[PDB]
Nucleic acid binder design. Structure first.
Ligand code: ZN
Ligand code: ZN
Lengths: 120, 120
RNA sequence: GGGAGAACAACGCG
RNA sequence: CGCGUUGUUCUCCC
């Protein structure tokens, strides 16, 4: 429905249709397209929490921006799963993503069977 | 009733009985005793608002502390009236003044006629 | 990654 | 002085 942009450099991030919610907190982003739009550097200090094990940090790929976008994690069998930081993004036109969520219907809950279809 | 202490150095500030509220926001402190417990240096940037004209900044007199306590102002005919910064103080016992206010009854509203009695 | 907490430095309105 | 906002640091829980 609505598009997210890098809060810092406003480059296209992803669509709300491509987001899923795991355990009513974490925002992950489906599709291999998205992965072209960020780069990753390894985590200084390891943390596992919830289902997740942390793998790396996400940064806007725009070299002049490198805004902190979130982390990648392994959840269940799904590795290199990008989880985005909701304060790091804004919406196309203006308002930020936090605000947007508050006034819109819930995003889709992550569905493992759907996920097993996209990443067999 | 309850005593306020310099948040930084814990030196005795004033009693809650010596505080008055002007326009449901500003906390001023009666009595010439109090004035011995802070020092002032003129205000770096003069601003009038509400009734007040700013005169100076307040600092804890303890030379090793000099915590920012608030400002002095002229209101109506009353010059060099100390207004304290509620985040700068804590309560004897520990909790801070902000917290204390939230769980206690309202402090006394400033009364100009009372004030005309103390400072004729 | 989400939820809180405290500190510092500043920006805006009165 | 109140109010609202930012950046950063430290920490807790998950
Ligand atoms: Zn960017
Ligand atoms: Zn002090």
């Amino acid at each position: 429905q609505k598009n997210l942009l890098c809060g810092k450099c406003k480059a296209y991030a992803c669509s709300t249709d491509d987001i899923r919610i795991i355990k009513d907190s974490h925002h992950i982003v489906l599709g291999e397209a998205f992965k072209e739009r960020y780069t990753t550097k390894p985590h200084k200090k390891p943390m596992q929490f919830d289902g997740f094990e942390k793998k790396s940090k996400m940064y806007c790929r725009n070299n002049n921006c490198q805004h902190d976008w979130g982390i990648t994690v392994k959840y269940l069998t799904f590795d290199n799963l990008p989880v985005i930081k909701i304060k790091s993004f804004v919406m196309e036109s203006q308002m930020d993503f936090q605000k947007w969520k508050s006034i819109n219907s819930s995003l889709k809950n992550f569905d493992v069977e759907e996920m097993s279809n996209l990443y067999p």
